[PDB]
Amino acid sequence: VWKDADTTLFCASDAKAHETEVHNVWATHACVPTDPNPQEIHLENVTENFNMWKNNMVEQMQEDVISLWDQSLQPCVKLTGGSVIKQACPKISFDPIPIHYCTPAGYVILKCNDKNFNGTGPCKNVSSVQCTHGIKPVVSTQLLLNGSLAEEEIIIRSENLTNNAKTIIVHLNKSVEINCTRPSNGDIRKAYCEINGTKWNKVLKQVTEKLKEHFNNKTIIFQPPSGGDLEITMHSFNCRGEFFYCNTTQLFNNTCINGTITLPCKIKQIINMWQGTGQAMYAPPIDGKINCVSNITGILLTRDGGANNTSNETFRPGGGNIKDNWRSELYKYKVVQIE
Numbered sequence: 128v129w130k131d132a133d134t135t136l137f138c139a140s141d142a143k144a145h146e147t148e149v150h151n152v153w154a155t156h157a158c159v160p161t162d163p164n165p166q167e168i169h170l171e172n173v174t175e176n177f178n179m180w181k182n183n184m185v186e187q188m189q190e191d192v193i194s195l196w197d198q199s200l201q202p203c204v205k206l207t208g209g210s211v212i213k214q215a216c217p218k219i220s221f222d223p224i225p226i227h228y229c230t231p232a233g234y235v236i237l238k239c240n241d242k243n244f245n246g247t248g249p250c251k252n253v254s255s256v257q258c259t260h261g262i263k264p265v266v267s268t269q270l271l272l273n274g275s276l277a278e279e280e281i282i283i284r285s286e287n288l289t290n291n292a293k294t295i296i297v298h299l300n301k302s303v304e305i306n307c308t309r310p311s312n313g314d315i316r317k318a319y320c321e322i323n324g325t326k327w328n329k330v331l332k333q334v335t336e337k338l339k340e341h342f343n344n345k346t347i348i349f350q351p352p353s354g355g356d357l358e359i360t361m362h363s364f365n366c367r368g369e370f371f372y373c374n375t376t377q378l379f380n381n382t383c384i385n386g387t388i389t390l391p392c393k394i395k396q397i398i399n400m401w402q403g404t405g406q407a408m409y410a411p412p413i414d415g416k417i418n419c420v421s422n423i424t425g426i427l428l429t430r431d432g433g434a435n436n437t438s439n440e441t442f443r444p445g446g447g448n449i450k451d452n453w454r455s456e457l458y459k460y461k462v463v464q465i466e
């Protein structure tokens with residue numbers, strides 16, 4: 128028997144000690160080796176409640192990634208709280224690796240295996256494990272990249288769907304590749320992402336159909352972000368250490384609800400830090416072909432308020448609270464203390 132509890136987790140990974148890549152280096156010093164023979168016990172006739180929106184595992188993962196980025200990605204200039212901090216900003220090797228979150232003695236992680244579990248409420252198929260799956264700490268806005276897919280139907284997750292101020296996590300059940308490149312040989316900050324339009328519009332149509340199930344069959348309309356920092360109004364992510372900002376206007380096209388969709392992107396040196404601490408300025412992009420091919424596995428949306436009088440609901444890509452990114456991966460886990 129057990130009870131819900133918070134405690135300090137540890138991390139495990141297959142990081143390489145000879146690698147200079149920054150996630151590898153961090154994990155080599157902050158994590159332990161993985162278990163080659165992990166035990167997972169199905170709990171017969173046990174129903175457990177989960178709440179992904181109140182899960183201290185998320186805060187702990189956030190603390191880790193902040194620590195990793197603070198040690199590994201210091202900028203040439205940092206503008207924070209009115210002060211100016213200057214330091215060396217060498218180019219790095221950057222490519223996220225899976226990190227497992229694990230409980231210490233006397234604790235265990237319960238895992239919800241209900242395929243269509245929305246993240247809050249009872250779960251009928253529960254197992255216990257010592258560690259989560261390997262979660263890559265991919266920082267992005269608008270689109271969730273390289274995450275885990277929903278096993279059955281597309282899932283809409285929100286702390287409170289009725290409250291337009293709460294971000295919606297759309298959990299996709301089928302990956303759509305996004306292929307971003309800053310071509311080798313001109314404007315060195317100019318880039319672009321390519322997406323199969325036939326595949327993407329198929330998925331967006333399905334997302335629309337799911338949203339209709341939640342919003343009483345009202346007409347579902349997508350619109351560009353209405354304002355805010357560039358990190359939010361654009362799909363931002365890090366590719367090989369460089370900060371990409373991509374215009375997603377073409378991705379959320381109501382008309383298509385079949386060719387190649389090419390989003391215009393730019394590598395930015397000056398950034399609003401997701402840690403919420405201010406601005407960071409980095410050096411110009413490395414030479415050559417900068418390329419990242421990722422799976423879109425989720426979408427972060429915000430719904431327009433005040434459309435209750437209408438027959439429409441309007442959605443705009445969003446994000447910016449990176450805790451939501453971790454939430455999208457940790458939603459099926461909770462820590463309990465064994466009594």
Ligand SMILES: N=C(N)N[C@H]1Cc2ccccc2[C@@H]1NC(=O)C(=O)Nc1ccc(Cl)c(F)c1
Binds near residue numbers: 358
């Ligand atoms: N901007 C704030 N004042 N505060 C932060 C913190 C915060 C908290 C809740 C909601 C929004 C925000 C803002 N978001 C961002 O700035 C941000 O996501 N940046 C960013 C940078 C780089 C990469 Cl690769 C990236 F994906 C993202």
Ligand SMILES: *[C@@H]1O[C@H](CO)[C@@H](O)[C@H](O)[C@H]1NC(C)=O
Binds near residue numbers: 241253
């Ligand atoms: C319970 O979840 C486990 C792990 O996904 C799965 O193997 C098993 O088939 C599930 N049981 C049912 C009845 O769905």
Ligand SMILES: *[C@@H]1O[C@H](CO)[C@@H](O)[C@H](O)[C@H]1NC(C)=O
Binds near residue numbers: 245246248283284288
């Ligand atoms: C998730 O499921 C719970 C319990 O079944 C329900 O109260 C809640 O409205 C659901 N939320 C969403 C976003 O479907």
Ligand SMILES: *[C@@H]1O[C@H](CO)[C@@H](O)[C@H](O)[C@H]1NC(C)=O
Binds near residue numbers: 273274301302421422
């Ligand atoms: C991309 O998603 C596919 C499934 O569509 C998966 O086979 C592959 O491992 C994923 N690559 C990642 C997560 O880097």
Ligand SMILES: *[C@@H]1O[C@H](CO)[C@@H](O)[C@H](O)[C@H]1NC(C)=O
Binds near residue numbers: 301337
């Ligand atoms: C993805 O989920 C949708 C419902 O949201 C469903 O119609 C579709 O069959 C699913 N696709 C796969 C590959 O299971």
Ligand SMILES: *[C@@H]1O[C@H](CO)[C@@H](O)[C@H](O)[C@H]1NC(C)=O
Binds near residue numbers: 287288289290291
């Ligand atoms: C969800 O949001 C709606 C709209 O703001 C609000 O009326 C309701 O109280 C919220 N529910 C909870 C449980 O906070």
Ligand SMILES: *[C@@H]1O[C@H](CO)[C@@H](O)[C@H](O)[C@H]1NC(C)=O
Binds near residue numbers: 420
């Ligand atoms: C990614 O896009 C580039 C074009 O910029 C192309 O040369 C490359 O083959 C693409 N990669 C994949 C895996 O589609």
Ligand SMILES: *[C@@H]1O[C@H](CO)[C@@H](O)[C@H](O)[C@H]1NC(C)=O
Binds near residue numbers: 336339
């Ligand atoms: C709701 O929308 C669906 C499309 O998924 C449609 O088949 C159905 O007729 C609609 N239901 C009502 C009651 O309007």
Ligand SMILES: *[C@@H]1O[C@H](CO)[C@@H](O)[C@H](O)[C@H]1NC(C)=O
Binds near residue numbers: 360361374
């Ligand atoms: C995205 O591209 C569209 C179409 O060119 C443009 O109107 C819009 O201003 C762009 N968004 C931003 C924030 O640059």
Ligand SMILES: *[C@@H]1O[C@H](CO)[C@@H](O)[C@H](O)[C@H]1NC(C)=O
Binds near residue numbers: 376380381382383
């Ligand atoms: C929406 O897609 C259609 C495809 O024919 C295109 O003509 C239109 O310009 C698109 N609108 C955008 C990208 O905002």
Ligand SMILES: *[C@@H]1O[C@H](CO)[C@@H](O)[C@H](O)[C@H]1NC(C)=O
Binds near residue numbers: 323385386388
């Ligand atoms: C998109 O995928 C389809 C198969 O579903 C394929 O026929 C087509 O060539 C692809 N188009 C692009 C633009 O990648």
Ligand SMILES: *[C@@H]1O[C@H](CO)[C@@H](O)[C@H](O)[C@H]1NC(C)=O
Binds near residue numbers: 365366
């Ligand atoms: C997603 O994973 C692929 C394959 O490991 C990697 O090449 C790509 O850069 C990743 N995307 C991001 C944004 O980390």
